[PDB]
Amino acid sequence: HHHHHMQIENRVFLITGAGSGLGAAVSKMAVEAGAKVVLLDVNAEAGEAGAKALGASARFQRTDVASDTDGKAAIAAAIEAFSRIDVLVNCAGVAPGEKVLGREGAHKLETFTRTISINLIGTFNMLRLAAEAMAKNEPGQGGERGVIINTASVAAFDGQIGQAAYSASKGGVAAMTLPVARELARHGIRVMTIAPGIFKTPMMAGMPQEVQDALGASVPFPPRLGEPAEYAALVRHIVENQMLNGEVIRLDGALRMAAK
Amino acid sequence: HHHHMQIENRVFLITGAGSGLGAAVSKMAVEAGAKVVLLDVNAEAGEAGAKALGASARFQRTDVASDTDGKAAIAAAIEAFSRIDVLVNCAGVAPGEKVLGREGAHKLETFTRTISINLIGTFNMLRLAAEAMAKNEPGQGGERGVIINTASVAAFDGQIGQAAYSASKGGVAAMTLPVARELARHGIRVMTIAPGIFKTPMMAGMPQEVQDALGASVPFPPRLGEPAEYAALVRHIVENQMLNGEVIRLDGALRMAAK
Amino acid sequence: HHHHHHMQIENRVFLITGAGSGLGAAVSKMAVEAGAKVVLLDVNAEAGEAGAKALGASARFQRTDVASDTDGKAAIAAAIEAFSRIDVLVNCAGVAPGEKVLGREGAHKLETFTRTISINLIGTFNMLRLAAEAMAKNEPGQGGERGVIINTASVAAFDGQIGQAAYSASKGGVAAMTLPVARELARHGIRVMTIAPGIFKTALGASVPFPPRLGEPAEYAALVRHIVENQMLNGEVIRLDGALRMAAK
Amino acid sequence: HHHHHMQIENRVFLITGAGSGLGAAVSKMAVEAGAKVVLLDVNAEAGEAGAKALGASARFQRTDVASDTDGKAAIAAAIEAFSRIDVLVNCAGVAPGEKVLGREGAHKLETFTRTISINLIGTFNMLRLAAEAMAKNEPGQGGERGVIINTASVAAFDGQIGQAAYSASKGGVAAMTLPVARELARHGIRVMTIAPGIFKTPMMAGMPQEVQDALGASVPFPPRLGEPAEYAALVRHIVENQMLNGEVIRLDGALRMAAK
Fold first, then answer.
1. To the nearest whole angstrom, how far is the Cα of D184 from the nearest Cα of chain B?
2. Which chains border D (3 or more CB–CB pairs < 8 Å)?
3. Where are the alpha helices (DSSP H) in chain C?
């Protein structure tokens, strides 16, 4: 702690995709740093188990991030549990691969739409509602009322063959950062975006080991899969450092994804 | 010019073609000796355009976000002119709505709609055009087609109230590379233009002092862009084979302020 | 006909660096053939004379070290004396060396880094400042325009490979100047643009997604032409690269 | 702290422009986190006073960062004092404003050249020499042998009227980050760049207070000058977070500089 350093203790985090991978690690980091967390996930089993393991500072609320009504209910539950919302972290996402021209014809419109719905619409939906709650907070240190962190992907910059939908959704997340920051600046709410490279996600851990090790060796340095706790450490830094706003930060070991 | 790609006789498919940018692209294309199939949701405007352009033009009513309308539009282009060489996606809406507004949070429905038309619509026509283009015989330099999408400077310098618009156009911009990478195998190039402030129908609706003020925000030329200038760039992209997988800002050096 | 805001290339005076070969030669050729005047600038007299000779009465040559204050001024004076004005500057002069930060003999030489910067970046800025000064004396033309400056960066500004610290630094510097320079020179009606070429000629093409070949210099020249003709292009860097994204190795 | 977290304690920092502003704050942060610092600056009085105030964990070496011979002397002095170099932070920089076409004629070539010399050639010079020293270190945690952090500027993206030289130099720094990171990955040396917005620098503190306050009010949130300690906090997070590599981070309160 030095003068403009923002304290993490006792701040209330709302976190999506919190039952696994990135979101799980953020929830763990937050609780261990002395914060409150409300876990949101569409999977009840995983979410209940996480909140259970983290203890009294955690709650879980089943949530389809793309739903208006679920989004509200998630806000209401966070307020009822902990009285306020200080930080939103959007980690819910899917990363499918589908060619524009595949063996069985054109990319399905439905699958494109669905990727957009979960990754981009879902992010916007939680963002708009969290923001509305955060704006009711009393202005804190430096006039700050909240911090919103979204998750894009290096696919927003280096999209591979088969990632039209994924790149479109994550590019959309990245490009919203600024206009949203610009508005929410009036209320003291910062808006930031992290663009991860290759991390040990559930999809990743599903692959055979030789394939996992090969992805890792594609990353210049460190030549390994990123650890979810490293994504969480960056989230922490964004909460603590008040000068970080309206920016997209690549967390990717210098990776630039080839076409194949 | 040896590797210069010829515009004459190529078949353009163009969305939002009943007005503004798409209208100017249609005009440019017909006057350079090409065929155009105009697509628009507004039948009156589209028919009138095709009528005015003459025998080299057809119109097909189309909701670009619809799977079935998209297919019908491809089928109509093939039936009329036998092939598709160029797709230009100009259909788009540019609404403003705050995240935290007078009536509460930004409506989810309005966000979703802006994404549907601007992004899902662009992807829909792209996927179906590409499929048709791949059936063409390889032409000059092995090229079978060119796809040109329209993003916006909002993809980079989004203003207060443009979350939806920036999201949709940022999505368009970010697709360019993964799509270009795949479609390279078929000789189909994929490019994106990011316009600044142009004399669109919404723009021409505004009172003159407001128009003039928007123009004076542009460093040089300090005016609204002319739709024919956007069309001139589209032409150059069709002609210049080295242009691929790139987003081009057409904006007089504008960098939009927050408000 | 041609649209109202279309900018005509006929009779405009081009000043072109690195004009004795490659990209600059092809720009000089395009310009003369479209009815413009060209002043060719190059450090190599043999190549420059031969080019100007082959292009004819609409071309002149002036030997020039683009990084030199006094050579830069002499080049402006020679253009004015020959053709009375300057309407377009195209900076194509450049070197593209590869040298590792940590090499077999030791660290990257400071002298070689400095020299790459001097030719690619300082040289570009030098010709830009002096051309701009001359262009500002022109009467305002169509749409109030007095000139166009076009600089050459490289995809190395974005996807720099192992060994390209110097090259990437110099071309990144060119790319980043585009905006602050365009912002100022907007007052005088001078547009400022930058082209970032991929791999151009001088299986080597098979790394390029499409077209899977080396770029032709005349294609770079076609883009220059389009920039001069399209008045809404300003303050932007355009990648001309067949969708290439250079790997590290 | 998590298993892949990189410890700052006992690492040796070499820092340029360390007598004032950003480099002084990085030195302070590093010493107070338990690290060693070698301060480099052209100004002896400021540098000695800094090293004096920081104590036994600090040394000062007078240095023109653009000089080959001074650069080498600096490396030798750091090795002789602390045996190794683990982190280089390049903060030495000048930020002049000069129009391309000014009231009294064209931008001087000498001034452009000088800004490039100090900001870009100087940064490259220290980098190449620090990298050479770092490569001799034994591979540490995660195989890492060093971290190099350069300072660009938001001028690399949003250059204002009068900033051709400054933008050119800082855009050059930014664009080197990837090709350097790609090579030095082989030796386990990470390379990162920070792009600061408006900070309380000595040039800034030289201005009258109304002009300061006005610059601060141009920043969306927080609407103030950035504190050098915040730039130092981000440096620290880069040294700690191993997945950060080959990237430029904007630290700017969502500022997008207007032309004027």
1. 27
2. A, B, C
3. 22-33, 45-55, 69-83, 110-117, 123-136, 156-159, 165-185, 217-229
